[PDB]
Write a protein that binds this ligand. Structure first.
Ligand SMILES: Cc1cc2c3c(c1C)C(C)(C)CC=[N+]3c1c([nH]c(=O)[nH]c1=O)N2C[C@H](O)[C@H](O)[C@H](O)COP(=O)(O)O
Ligand SMILES: Cc1cc2c3c(c1C)C(C)(C)CC=[N+]3c1c([nH]c(=O)[nH]c1=O)N2C[C@H](O)[C@H](O)[C@H](O)COP(=O)(O)O
Ligand SMILES: [Mn+2]
Ligand SMILES: [Mn+2]
Ligand code: NA
Ligand code: NA
Lengths: 452, 454
């Protein structure tokens, strides 16, 4: 239950019967995403064997099911956030140095075609996206002053066969490396089709891996041995050796061009706007490459939740007794709604739980508290707790004129109202709140023919 | 700037002119506390050279001025909470093992009179206190199962020459050790060590979440002295005595053996209910030569014990969740427990409200939180009143939390349940001229000849 590269992942899923093979030709324009969308969240990923008759198939839906990611590493969905955090803890304490290897030993260097981005089966995802996007690509970039690596993930729109437009949010480390090159232009690699270890490294936030620190070793914790890197053609750049595809890239500061729209976590479009142009100097491919794309939605909600929930749980359980679990729900875009599950020990702690949760995660708009006997990850069950347990008069806590996330239109200019729901039963516990229960039953113990 | 025992402290204060010597005879009944009360909070402690013509003087007022405690360790008042926290951090990381020493080497074992508590100049403090109290005594008690030490501070009322009645709050570690003695058929032995240096006081006052039940917090004291904490076998011998104490009482207490104690002052400023609470019997008494009896006046002495230990953790927790936090005060007006003022440098609208959430979440006893800017003195209630008068928006700046957990001693929170309220007394952001405070030139008074009254 360790994985060197995406091949390992796909074979494991194929073997486990968690792969949906779409054998028919599909169009990269809208149709592909449309099919993915009908499968979003189920316990399987989707391999498209034939995209506009490309030789390169595309994989989508790797991240939309915690059960699936858990199956790849032998952990239950519920234990995955702790699993990932424990591994990032081990990396902080004893990092694994990368392994630099010779160009002709690096599977990704198998081929180097003339740079033609339009030959790649890059999907146009949502119906109003400003073009085809690579959105599962991990950027590796060296500090122009200190050569220290930074690993981030960023959306790149294809303009033409050799140009991408990239979105770099404010205070991103890639942004800061560009500021340094602009005291001299910035080279880097874009590594598409990487294993979850690289993905989690890329997505690890600033306060876990500072600017002056190399987060890429996080990936080493999800594979035997160290992360394999290789000198690019550049040579100011470093390439991920076990990537399916890798693009050597260069970008000048103060050189902007219209990119977007694209889906944001909110489920709304980004504003099309002048953002940095990046020019693709070279292209490397394994033989038998699969192109890896992410469907905006649960794939992104789980990336954020799996990395963020353990810290949040740690911060709340430290300030409040009886905390069991914290969910950054998919309904809340893995960012705007937290459900906190606790075992009450005294009246009043449920309200402290609301304060602690809002204090620990500034983007949150809603917090809901529920008891140990409600499934915090089932929105039906939280709705039920709201319907039978919430006192609307004393259990709704509203915070005005506070800081929040500017992308969410409930928070214009990072400012608005937050609301907590205390959907706990009354304490001390009373019979009128004891839920009915059906005997738990192993279905494998019976012969059951289900449809035919 | 290290201190082995209380002698070191008193000499340092005497040398520094931070000692008030009351040379006249005073009565331990009410009069002594009455005099202390007139001096509460000033930059000096009070040594009573003559209490009912006892040979033993009493020291009071060691903890009521952060400036004074700072002077003892060479730190400014403002840096004292961090000073203490850093030292407790070093102890958590690399504890110093205690040094056991021979009875005739232990200064406290100099004398062992027959047990007469009424021969000690133990003050009756507040006018309705149910008797004389020792309230600066640090209890050292060994786990009856595992022998692991626990250091706590607890009020003991004198009943007669050989009996005390003690108050043990719910979930105290001494409470848990007493459960073990009774669950094991023996009662609980321990020592009561009076006249200890601040390092022992801070060990005693260190809460459960810093030093769990299964952990020996007494090494914290080693961080405020050269070398390790000196202990010594008592006469018991289930007990361990602090060698450098001024006075130490070997004590035994049986579970389910209650007797009326109280009233006594609580941090709230109100009396505890007189009620059946555990009787403890004083088996033996040890004294240094030249012993001074150490008492605490309820009030600022207690507010500062709690604030000095609690503020750095609270600041750490809030500055981690909110940008631009500068300082947090557990104010004396709020009994060092119920009001926190948070000072910040605003960087964007809305963070002041998150500061309220973070502060209430980090310190459950709190009833009020007030936020103010860098240009308001968070420790001056006049200045925070001013921020309230000119900056608070009463409509949008008052945040009320209902039906939440709080501290049961505070009568705003019957049964550890009630309403909390936060005041956002910050200026508007972005900063505007209409909120720029006037300023007078800073001026050295020593640069001028000034005759101030005759
Ligand atoms: C999981 C994830 C994270 C995206 C992301 C997406 C996903 C799926 C997409 C591909 C669906 C949409 C685009 N994304 C962007 C993004 N950050 C950014 O500045 N611009 C982006 O366009 N991020 C987050 C970014 O990579 C993280 O904040 C890293 O922690 C940044 O690394 P750093 O801390 O070293 O700056
Ligand atoms: C600073 C301080 C703390 C008092 C205290 C006082 C002071 C000055 C007095 C002397 C003014 C009034 C009495 N006090 C009592 C008390 N705890 C308790 O259970 N009963 C008390 O009577 N405490 C608190 C107690 O000592 C601390 O909570 C310790 O951290 C307990 O240690 P533990 O966690 O090891 O049990
Ligand atoms: Mn980084
Ligand atoms: Mn303890
Ligand atoms: Na990162
Ligand atoms: Na203690």
């Amino acid at each position: 239950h360790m994985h060197k590269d995406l091949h390992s992942i796909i074979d494991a899923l194929d073997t486990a019967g968690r792969l949906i093979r779409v054998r028919s030709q599909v169009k990269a324009e809208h149709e592909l995403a449309g099919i993915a969308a009908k499968y979003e969240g189920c316990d399987k990923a989707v391999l498209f064997e034939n995209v506009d008759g490309n030789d390169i198939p595309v994989l989508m839906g790797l991240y939309w099911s915690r059960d699936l990611l858990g199956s790849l590493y032998g952990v239950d969905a519920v234990d995955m956030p702790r699993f990932i955090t424990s591994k990032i803890s081990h990396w902080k304490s004893e990092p694994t140095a990368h392994q630099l290897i010779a160009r002709e030993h690096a599977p990704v260097m198998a081929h180097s075609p003339r740079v033609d981005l339009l030959s790649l089966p890059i999907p146009v995802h949502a119906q109003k996206d400003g073009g085809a996007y690579v959105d599962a690509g991990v950027v590796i970039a060296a500090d122009p002053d200190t050569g220290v690596l930074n690993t981030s993930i960023q959306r790149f729109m294809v303009e033409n066969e050799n140009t991408l437009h990239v979105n770099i949010d404010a205070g991103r480390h890639l942004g800061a490396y560009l500021a340094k090159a602009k005291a001299k232009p910035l080279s880097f690699s874009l590594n598409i089709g990487v294993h979850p270890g690289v993905h989690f490294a890329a997505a690890t936030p600033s306060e876990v891996a500072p600017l002056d620190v190399d987060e890429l070793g996080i990936a080493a914790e999800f594979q035997d041995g160290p992360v394999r890197i290789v000198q690019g053609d550049d040579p100011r750049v470093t390439v991920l050796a076990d990537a399916m595809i890798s693009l050597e890239c260069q970008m000048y500061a103060d050189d902007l061009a219209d990119e977007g729209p694209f889906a944001e976590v909110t489920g709304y479009y980004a504003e099309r706007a002048p953002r940095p142009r990046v020019t693709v100097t070279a292209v490397h491919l394994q033989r038998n490459p699969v192109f890896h794309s992410i469907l905006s939605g649960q794939e992104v909600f789980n990336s954020v939740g799996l990395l963020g929930e353990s810290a949040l749980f740690d911060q709340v359980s430290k300030q409040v007794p009886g905390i069991l679990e914290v969910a950054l729900t998919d309904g809340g875009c893995g960012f705007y709604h937290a459900v906190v599950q606790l075992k009450q020990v005294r009246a009043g702690w449920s309200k402290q739980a609301i304060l602690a949760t809002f204090a620990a995660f500034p983007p949150l708009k809603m917090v809901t508290i529920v008891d140990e006997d409600v499934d915090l990850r089932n929105p039906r069950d939280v709705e039920w707790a709201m319907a039978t347990r919430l006192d609307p008069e004393r259990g709704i806590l509203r915070i005005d004129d506070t800081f929040g996330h500017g992308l969410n239109p409930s928070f214009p200019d990072y400012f608005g109202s937050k609301v907590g729901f205390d959907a706990t039963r009354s304490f001390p516990f009373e019979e009128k709140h004891e839920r009915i229960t059906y005997q738990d039953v192993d279905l494998s113990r019976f012969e059951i023919v289900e449809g035919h």
